Amino acid sequence: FSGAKIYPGRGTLFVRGDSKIFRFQNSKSASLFKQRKNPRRIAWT
Amino acid sequence: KYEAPRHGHLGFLPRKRAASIRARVKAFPKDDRSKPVALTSFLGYKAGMTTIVRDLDRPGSKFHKREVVEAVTVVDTPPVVVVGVVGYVETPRGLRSLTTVWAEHLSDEVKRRFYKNWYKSKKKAFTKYSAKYAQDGAGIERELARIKKYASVVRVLVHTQIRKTPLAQKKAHLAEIQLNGGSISEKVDWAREHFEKTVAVDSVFEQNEMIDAIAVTKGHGFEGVTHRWGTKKLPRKTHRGLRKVACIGAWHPAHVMWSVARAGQRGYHSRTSINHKIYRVGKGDDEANGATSFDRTKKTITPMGGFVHYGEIKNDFIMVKGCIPGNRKRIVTLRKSLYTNTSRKALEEVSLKWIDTASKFG
Amino acid sequence: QGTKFRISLGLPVGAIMNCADNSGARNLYIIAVKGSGSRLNRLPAASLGDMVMATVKKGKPELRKKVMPAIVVRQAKSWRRRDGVFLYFEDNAGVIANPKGEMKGSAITGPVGKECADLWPRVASNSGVVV
RNA sequence: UGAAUAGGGUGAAGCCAGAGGAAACUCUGGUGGAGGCUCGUAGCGGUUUGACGUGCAAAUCGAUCGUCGAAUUUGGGUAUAG
RNA sequence: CAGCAGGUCUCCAAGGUGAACAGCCUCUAGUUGAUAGAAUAAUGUGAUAAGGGAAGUCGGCAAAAUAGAUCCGUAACUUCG
RNA sequence: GCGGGAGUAACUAUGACUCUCUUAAGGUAGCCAAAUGCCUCGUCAUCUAAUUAGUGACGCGCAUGAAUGGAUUAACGAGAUUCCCACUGUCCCUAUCUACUAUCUAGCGAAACCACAGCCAAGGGAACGGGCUUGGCAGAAUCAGCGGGGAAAGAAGACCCU
RNA sequence: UGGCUUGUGGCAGUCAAGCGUUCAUAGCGACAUUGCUUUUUGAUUCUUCGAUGUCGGCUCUUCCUAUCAUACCGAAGCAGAAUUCGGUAAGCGUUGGAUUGUUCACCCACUAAUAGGGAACGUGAGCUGGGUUUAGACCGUCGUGAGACAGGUUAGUUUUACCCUACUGAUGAAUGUUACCGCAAUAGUAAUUGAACUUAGUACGAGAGGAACAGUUCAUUCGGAUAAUUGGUUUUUGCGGCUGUCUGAUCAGGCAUUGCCGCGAAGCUACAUCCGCUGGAUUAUGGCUGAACGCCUCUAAGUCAGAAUCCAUGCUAGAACGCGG
């Protein structure tokens, strides 16, 4: 989920749709893709 | 008297517990008939892994010299201390010595160990830690030991130095270790300069050989037939026979042999894994890890934090691409490889491109 | 041929999978694989960039029925690339092909893989969105 | 011959009103009565599955399933014996 | 027969939440049985999960989809109940 | 209770109709390959990666037929098949965590229950021997495990005849 | 049921006249038989009633090769290559679905391709109980009938703790003692195939076609190793929502309805990660010098080249193997 820093040779990409490129970053942030927690409340993301 | 196919490895019989915490190996890897003096094995502690982002060894690949993600056990190798270089020769009976050549000063963790002070077990007699034994007269007669003609492989009884690795105990871990070299004469001559106190790590392990990964594995449970061998379940999965099995014997004859699919100890021997190819040797601090993702868990080399259940590494390590038995805390014994398969990729160092560092957790 | 990848399990016999090219069935099928070998209970797992065989279970009679073997395009399983970049898609979908690997329709729609087009240069001709 | 079914949904037949129809059909509301109408508890029946069988009852126990104003269930007294 | 996981007529009817007498939960009011501690294998007894979607087994057995209130919209044909 | 043999229409191919024998005298309306069919993967269409079910007929009825009845024909079910939509730990594919016990301990205290004995390969043989012939092999103090034999827990076998 | 024979018969040697272009044996084979053998398919009451419980499949415990495929060789009435046939030799690999209770019967999609025989077919105190020994009821067919049938249909008991042994793990004790570990006189073990880069557009040919042989890499699959860039679980410790009641009330806090229900990381693991072929002894076969035997030729003197398996390397271990200071 979160707006962290992806490495050149690390980082899982989900392309669900017409190649809608998402990615995980943090472990805690991958979790907020089940629950759908929006970046309104959670500020650091 | 039928057969069903070989689910699981047969010849780990008997499945005996490896009582001693360090692994043993009777059939040692035979001489480096190239390097004039070496050891056969060494010493390590199992710590944790990193993802080495490097490039391939095999140079003709379809995706040659791309980015390659790889496993690596970064095991800590403090050098071992000699008590005495035992001069095993022959007699007309067998493999019998004549004298050892002692070291003068041992380590500190020789205090508590040299004994067998444990309950329901034998002692030793009062062969405690060293006074000042045979080394002065003994050092010259190991030259005369090869003049016998009745002469064998000369070896050396060693002990560890512990706290240096983050484990805090000061009762040393013992083993004898064989000296290798050019000939029988050379593994005596150059080993006279080894018994001084401590040996070298780099004598046995040259960078980019292979290293066979023997150690002591975990004892899983009293594992039944499903996990220990490799039987299924029945898809009806009712009554008595869920995680059971069928045949153990046979009608004609009633007496079978040691193949049978029963329950008992899994893992936990001094089990040998084959030619894990040595990546690099790094002395101090070089590589790091700690990346905030799920991959595999709970062994992190210098992140923000440390390793869990080990302590943070500030020593001298050897990097084996692959693995080595045990889990956290467990002390391992890295044996070298006698049959080195691929050509030695030494001289220059192997690539480290970049590696992550953050938390491992959230 | 080597995929150079990680080819994962979990595409057994059956396969309700969508029509990846513009032939346009509904439910396809996957029968025997290319180079089979399993056990009873144990289902033959297909993969992506392959050339597994196929009929078509349900749909409409211009695209339904009677074999022409396929090649699967997408799976939602995450697979380890050697260069450390994982990629899972969306929907399962097979291109109904011909027995040495080329599409029956005019082009593939939806995402496709890199390595699927590395294997077959014939399927690489009229690809979809290369991810 | 004595005792027991709370709760909750519909409603022909009879009878009246209102718009509409040559007249009858149609068509809008109220009043009202006969249910194996009908529904959920009491009373009451037994489809599937697991554990028991040297154990709690000489066919047992757990999870699971049916009916109920009708050909309704049940107690007591009394009579019928190869 | 039993100091046995049992048979056994039959009386009375508070608060707030949910039709009632489901459930929910406290009163008036009552009580944990004729042996016990610590670790908590294999194996028999409970739940979770990637990807697939029936492909498995005598056996959709097992297990999944869905659910209320209120409004819209809806199929053959009758012994016309 | 409700028939046989023989002859017969352009042309492949068939018997309307006719004769003859036999008996008390030889069947209508309507339907068919059955809870009944030897013959039969019969014969044809559609479906199916193969598909004999689904569903379309063929005629080649071993042996259909009106009152302990054919036939019209709506409602109802812990009763019986298939196609079709979404889908499913049953399986692929197994892993992980949890409740309770096993391990281990105290107390009091069962159960039907009593062959000298307890290796295997070859050989003879009351006929498939750890037990008998030769040869190879086989030590004891002890506990946790697991379903192959001996053939357990048991009743004078279920077949089978008096 | 076991024994016996091989009846009923299978296979081969093979009498070898025929017939295939000529032409006993490329091939096809009248007419049949001899030895072997125990498979089609049964002759026999020899040996058995204080049990002699069935079929197809799941799961796990062997040995042989009457040989499908992998190593090694030779020949044709075979142009390379497609096609056709025979010998050395048992270490390993030997698919997925549909018709049908069902292997048989019978069809399809691939794939490098999908063998033969025995062993109480491991085989109901591991497992299903569809196939498989009684008891509701009906039809056809037969008999005066109660009812029957070498014909079909509908429902209809898998109990429990292994005495001794096989047997898989863990401890305790024997030539002073002995923490600690190396010999290898010995015991257990591991195993396979395809595609692609590329060889090569070369050999050879009418035309379609396209061989010897290298270097290089990797994908199915198995075991052991497996805890980082993957995928998930994590009742431990934190985070979201709903109902009732108590603690005097409000309030602040609790029990309780599975972890109430809604969402992560300790601790573990795969749907996953890493790794894997030395010397010695010899066979078919071909030669080498030279016989038996004036010539000749692999053997009698003499002397060499030579196969997955064989056999050892690689790892575990009561001198009879954990050595022994």
Side-chain angles (χ1 to χ4, degrees), chain A residues 15 17-19, chain C residues 17-26 28 48 71-75 89-96 103-113 116 123-131:
Chain A
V15 287
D18 55 300
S19 306
Chain C
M17 64 178 170
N18 194 4
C19 193
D21 66 3
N22 49 50
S23 63
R26 277 172 49 231
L28 298 180
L48 310 176
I71 173 172
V72 198
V73 185
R74 287 166 276 173
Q75 189 183 5
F89 288 110
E90 176 170 48
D91 55 303
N92 288 294
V95 166
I96 320 174
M103 62 284 292
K104 189 157 72 184
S106 64
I108 309 177
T109 191
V112 301
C116 306
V123 182
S125 296
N126 297 111
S127 298
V129 184
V130 187
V131 182

Side-chain angles (χ1 to χ4, degrees), chain B residues 73-193:
Chain B
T73 42
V74 186
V75 295
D76 251 355
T77 176
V80 294
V81 177
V82 172
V83 305
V85 52
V86 55
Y88 274 96
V89 286
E90 295 291 297
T91 54
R93 170 53 182 78
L95 177 51
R96 303 191 173 246
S97 304
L98 182 54
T99 59
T100 196
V101 194
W102 281 80
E104 189 178 64
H105 293 66
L106 307 183
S107 65
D108 201 75
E109 44 270 281
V110 298
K111 275 165 50 67
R112 303 170 186 157
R113 186 56 162 107
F114 289 113
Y115 280 151
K116 178 75 180 182
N117 196 125
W118 299 79
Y119 299 106
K120 193 167 59 59
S121 56
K122 53 254 293 293
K123 285 77 249 177
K124 176 58 191 182
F126 44 85
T127 296
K128 313 193 186 297
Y129 54 89
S130 64
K132 207 295 187 185
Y133 303 125
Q135 60 186 125
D136 302 300
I140 185 168
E141 55 175 297
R142 299 301 85 205
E143 208 286 313
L144 285 297
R146 305 92 93 265
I147 306 299
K148 296 184 56 167
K149 273 67 78 285
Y150 286 85
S152 200
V153 178
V154 166
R155 301 155 192 163
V156 55
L157 197 301
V158 295
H159 54 289
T160 55
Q161 57 187 300
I162 304 184
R163 73 192 305 168
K164 166 63 279 199
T165 53
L167 188 63
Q169 59 191 231
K170 300 168 65 275
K171 181 174 174 188
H173 313 289
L174 275 36
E176 181 146 297
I177 184 172
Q178 184 192 72
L179 290 146
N180 284 347
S183 62
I184 302 299
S185 299
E186 298 190 66
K187 63 179 65 187
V188 173
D189 285 306
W190 313 128
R192 288 185 278 91
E193 288 75 61

Side-chain angles (χ1 to χ4, degrees), chain B residues 6 26 46 51 61 124 263 295 298-299 324 335:
Chain B
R6 311 284 68 170
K26 297 185 70 186
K46 188 172 180 177
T51 298
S61 177
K124 176 58 191 182
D295 187 78
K298 301 168 265 67
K299 323 279 170 297
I324 187 163
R335 80 177 210 139

Side-chain angles (χ1 to χ4, degrees), chain B residues 170-221:
Chain B
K170 300 168 65 275
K171 181 174 174 188
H173 313 289
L174 275 36
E176 181 146 297
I177 184 172
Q178 184 192 72
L179 290 146
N180 284 347
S183 62
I184 302 299
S185 299
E186 298 190 66
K187 63 179 65 187
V188 173
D189 285 306
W190 313 128
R192 288 185 278 91
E193 288 75 61
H194 280 61
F195 74 82
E196 292 285 296
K197 180 171 171 171
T198 191
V199 299
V201 185
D202 312 296
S203 53
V204 44
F205 291 114
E206 178 180 295
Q207 194 188 261
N208 309 121
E209 302 184 74
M210 276 131 283
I211 171 276
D212 301 335
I214 187 178
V216 182
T217 328
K218 193 245 176 190
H220 301 79

Side-chain angles (χ1 to χ4, degrees), chain A residues 9-12 27-28 31 34-35:
Chain A
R10 164 167 181 258
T12 300
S27 301
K28 165 161 40 192
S31 316
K34 282 200 196 174
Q35 186 55 295

